[PDB]
Each structure stands twice: as C-alpha cells, then as structure tokens.
C-alpha cells in the first residue's frame, strides 16, 4: 500500500525553538511527497508538495526535505500560529496515503488556573436534575486535578471532565469539571466547593458556594 | 474564491445508506479531479477515491471500494459520495477536497447509530454567581442532553469572540452529549451588556439563543 510512516506522534516546543517531523515509505516514492497543517476544528491546509516546494501563502519558516522514503517537515521557527497537527501525504502511487499524523503543541512557563464556579440554574432543577460547574481558565501545564466536596464529602464518580486543545494567544489551557446531582439530593445539601489542585499552585486552591435561596 | 461546500451533519441508522454532496462554487468544475477523505478521531486520514468531473472517470481505494459510490452532476457542480450498509464503522467526518487538495469543504459529520435524534437542552451560567469577584467575570451556557455531534454555539450572534472557550463535547453515560461554552469578560459590563449564547444542533433542527444575566 505505500505506507507512511509518521514519527514523532506527540512533540512539544518553545516558541522560539526548532521542530522537525519525519515520513519513512515502506517503498520507494521519489519526490511525489506533501505535507499539510490542521488545527483543531478545520479542515487540512496544503503546506508542502513535491516533497519541498512550500504552497503560496506558507511562511518559509516551513521547509520540506528529503528524497526517495526518507522524508521531513521542518519548522525552523515554532510560533504560536503553529500550533496544531501536521500530516504527511504521497502521491507517485494509487491509493493516496496519509502519514499518522503529528499533534504539535507549545511549551511554556508554569501558571496557575483562576477559578470559577456555578451553580446550577432554576431553569435546569425543574428538569429533575441538577449540573454544578466549576472553571479552570488559561493555566499550563495541561496536568490538572480537580476534587468536589459538599457537605464536606468528597464525590466520586459523579463528575465529568473537559479540556480545551492549547489556545494560540496564550499558549495555555482551560478545563471544566461537572458534577451532576438530582434536584433531591441537590436541596437537602448546601455547602458546594471545588478544589483545584496545580502546580502552579503553592496548596490547591478551593471554590464554593451556598445553595442560597 | 474556491469555496466546496458540503452538506450538513448526518445521522444515519445502521444498514441504511447515506449520500453526501460537495458543491463546487468558483471555478470551472470539470476541470479538477474532486477526492474525498475520511477522518475518525486521534486516527489518520483516509483517501476513498477520487473521480473526475468531467470525464466521469473514477478510481477508488481498494479498501473503500464496496461501501463508497462516487459521482457527480455538471448541471449543479455537485458532487456526491453514497455510502452504503453503514455501521458504527463509517462514523467519521467526511471531507470532499480539489484534485491537487489546496481547497477543502468543510467537512459533514457522519454518525451512524440506531439512537434517535435529541435536540440540546440550554442553561444559563450565572456571571460570578451572587459574589462579584474582582476585574474579571466569567459566565456562559451549559448545551447538554443532546444527540449525535454535532452542535455550534457562537455569543452575541457572532459578534463576540474575545475569551470565548467553547470545551470539546463529552459522551455522557446516558448515550447523550453535553458540553459549556465559556466567555470571560469586564464585571463592569455586566447587567447592562446582554450576553446571548446561540446554540444550532442542525441533527434535530434545533436553534436556541439564551439570554445570561447576573445570577440573583
Ligand atoms: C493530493 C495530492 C496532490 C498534491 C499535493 C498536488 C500538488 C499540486 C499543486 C498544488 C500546489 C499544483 C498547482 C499541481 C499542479 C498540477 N497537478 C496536476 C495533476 C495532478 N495532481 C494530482 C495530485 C496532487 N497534486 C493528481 C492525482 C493529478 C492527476 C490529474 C489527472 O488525472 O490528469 C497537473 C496536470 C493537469 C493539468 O494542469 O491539466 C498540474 C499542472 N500539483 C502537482
Ligand atoms: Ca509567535
Ligand atoms: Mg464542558
Ligand atoms: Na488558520
Ligand atoms: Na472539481
Ligand atoms: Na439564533
């Protein structure tokens, strides 16, 4: 089939520094070779063809090489505006083939996540339930642990958690945890409290709130 | 301006069939090979064939070969790939893209489940809930209970997108999706800005907007 191999699948690089990824042909390909750039939620742009001809728009800091199986992308300069995914093509044989992929992301200093923290609204309690959310905004590194407590009892099992992909303005992330209750076992309680544990964090801070009203 | 469009999301029943379309806008159609790709989460991307506009001409990936059909319509320069006996196996985000692939559609998810359609439930997140904190405000709109993926949400219609985080969608256990979309802003803007999150889940043809206003 002409397999491509991509390596590395996972790299992380300071803005500023070097990162290169590499396609190994399982056969000989020639110089039919491409490369393309996808950030989360878009479709796959063309970067590089003819295995180092770089697609008009594509700043030179993106350089392809190689010849035969051996081949590379190269961003001599890694910025914000680069992070994303990056995919290998071939073309000199039917069927096309795609490379595994590569999801490049940022390397930065340590910060601490500010949270926040919501209860859940009258509008949702009449459904028979309840989501109490609390919020981790712009902190790195991506590593995080989050604990609910009420009534001072520690929850387990009934939260569910998500993580943005790596934003590019600030290089950091963000993370929101859940916790899902019944309007019963929600009214009889009062005292909610999230607890971020980071290390950014000199002790983890904790975030709370009454079931005022 | 080379701009494919493609279908919206679609949610298939298992057994059935499906039948996507790319509709070419800014350029001469019979004049380029069209390709189409599919992608499935954290996995590569898959080329099913391509086929030529104009000649009608069609080559396929010999491993797509029995459940892909590819064709085309120069009346409309539309394309269109059927796909056929589907199962969980052909969920995925399909994409139709130019011969030489520097133009892509956008790409129309495809989720084939016996599960039926559930439009999103919306609720407000409360700007610092009672508490007013200090410089910076938070608040937004919990989507959930809502089936298959996937779901847009945008603030002010379109109009606000600084510090807007909109978290990827979780499989909750009851088969359901759910997910926030958060916007930080100026605690003085408060009350008298309006803060309206506009949720589309195009599946069930629903279409909400929510107003979110200081907790009280
Ligand atoms: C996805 C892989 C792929 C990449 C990347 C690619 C790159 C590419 C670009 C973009 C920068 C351009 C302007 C051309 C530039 C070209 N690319 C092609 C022709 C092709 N190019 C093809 C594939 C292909 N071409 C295929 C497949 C054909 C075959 C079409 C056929 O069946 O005759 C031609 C010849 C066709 C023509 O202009 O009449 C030029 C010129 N190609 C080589
Ligand atoms: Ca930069
Ligand atoms: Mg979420
Ligand atoms: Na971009
Ligand atoms: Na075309
Ligand atoms: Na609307």
């Known amino acids: 089939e002409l397999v491509m191999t991509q390596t590395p699948k996972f790299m992380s690089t300071t803005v500023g520094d070097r990162v290169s990824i590499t396609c190994k042909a399982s056969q000989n390909v020639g110089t039919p070779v491409a490369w393309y750039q996808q950030k989360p939620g878009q479709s796959p742009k063309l970067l590089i063809y003819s295995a180092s001809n770089r697609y008009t728009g594509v700043p030179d800091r993106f350089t392809g090489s190689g010849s035969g199986t051996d081949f590379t992308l190269t961003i001599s300069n890694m910025q914000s505006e680069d992070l994303a995914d990056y995919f290998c093509q071939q073309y000199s044989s039917y069927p096309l083939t795609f490379g595994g992929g590569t999801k490049v992301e940022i390397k930065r200093t340590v910060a601490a996540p500010s949270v926040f923290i919501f209860p859940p609204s009258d509008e949702q309690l009449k459904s028979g339930t309840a989501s109490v959310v609390c919020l981790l905004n712009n902190f790195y590194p991506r590593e995080a642990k989050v604990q609910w407590k009420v009534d001072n009892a520690l929850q387990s099992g009934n939260s569910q958690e998500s993580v943005t992909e790596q934003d590019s303005k600030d290089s950091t992330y963000s993370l929101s945890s859940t916790l899902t209750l019944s309007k019963a076992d929600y009214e009889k309680h009062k005292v909610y409290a999230c607890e971020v544990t980071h290390q950014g964090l000199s002790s983890p801070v904790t975030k709370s709130f009454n079931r005022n009203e | 301006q080379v701009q494919l469009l493609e279908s919206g999301a679609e949610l298939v029943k298992p057994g059935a069939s499906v039948k996507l379309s790319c509709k070419a806008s800014?350029?001469?159609?019979?004049?380029?090979?069209m390709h189409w790709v599919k992608q499935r989460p954290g996995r590569g991307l898959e080329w099913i064939g391509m086929?030529?506009?104009?000649?009608?001409?069609?080559k396929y990936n010999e491993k797509f070969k029995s459940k892909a059909t590819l064709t085309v319509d120069k009346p409309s320069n539309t394309a269109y790939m059927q796909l056929s006996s589907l199962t969980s196996e052909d969920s995925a985000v399909y994409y139709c893209?130019?011969?030489?692939?520097?133009?892509w559609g956008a790409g129309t998810t495809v989720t084939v489940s016996s599960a039926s359609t559930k439009g999103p439930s919306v609720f407000p997140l409360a700007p610092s809930s009672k508490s007013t904190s200090g410089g910076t405000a938070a608040l937004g709109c919990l989507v959930k209970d809502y089936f298959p993926e996937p779901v847009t949400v945008s603030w002010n219609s379109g109009a606000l997108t600084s510090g807007v985080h909109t978290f990827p969608a979780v499989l909750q256990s009851s088969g359901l999706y759910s997910l926030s979309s958060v916007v930080t802003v100026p605690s003085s803007s408060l009350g008298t800005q309006t803060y309206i999150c506009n949720v589309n889940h195009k599946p069930s043809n629903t279409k909400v907007d929510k107003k979110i206003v200081p907790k009280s």
């Open positions: 086929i030529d506009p104009n000649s009608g001409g069609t």
């Open positions: 893209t130019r011969r030489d692939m520097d133009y």
């Open positions: 800014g350029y001469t159609f019979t004049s380029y090979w």
